[PDB]
Amino acid sequence: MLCVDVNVLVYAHRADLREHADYRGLLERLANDDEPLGLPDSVLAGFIRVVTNRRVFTEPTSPQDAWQAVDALLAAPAAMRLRPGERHWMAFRQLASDVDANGNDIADAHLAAYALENNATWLSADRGFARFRRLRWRHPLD
């Protein structure tokens, strides 16, 4: 199973961004592939918060547009929504303990826990994920 971060969804959706052509192709391929594409609820929620956000974009995506994009992706044959498992809280604590996580590292550990609990690859633009030795993390364009 491959799990993806907020950045992968944002690049795939926003045409204005330079990274968009690579991300849109990657997302369509992951969504229609045999391997399940794991989508954490926090990732789906994070993508809506970022695209619709006035601080992030001069012209924010409409919430109605953001929700339709989430709905279409969840519709994809590979897509599986992930809700934190009973294992997610222990996995999050183990990841946080591994790096002595502080500030935003805690947010990363919480996102990372979805991949660790599922033994899934975690795809993120952020290379800070390299910090979690236990985590299986790859650059999305790798």
Next chain:
Amino acid sequence: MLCVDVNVLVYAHRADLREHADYRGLLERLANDDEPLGLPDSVLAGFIRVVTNRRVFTEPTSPQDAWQAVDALLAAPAAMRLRPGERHWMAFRQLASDVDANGNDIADAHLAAYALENNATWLSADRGFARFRRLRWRHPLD
């Protein structure tokens, strides 16, 4: 059941902050009360992220200290950690739809969903929570 926001935990633990005596008493009263104190995993994670944050505090609480406080709160008789339930995703969508949520509203809706799913009172310092008519929200000091 009463659910509490990150600010309520943060005020309770930071002696330096002005709100601390009031928040510390309320939190201790909630933790030892018969009505369950519902603590979402996202709220517990958020409290560690804020207390240990270098931008937020000139001297951040240590992660070791932050986790021991979380472990202590969990040990309290009222306290129940909450994981999102089967209805959490639909409840989050309903709250976001109710206010046309955009940007940070999405984060508030996701947190508010733990209270709506559990039919719990949401205690938050933020008065913006009044915008969710479906939510039962009260200021914590009230």
Next chain:
Amino acid sequence: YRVQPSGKGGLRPGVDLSSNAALAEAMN
């Protein structure tokens, strides 16, 4: 499944999508 692309006008100044910590600071 096909992405339906949307958006125009780019990012606000100083915002980098690549870093979760920076994006979090920019949003609040």
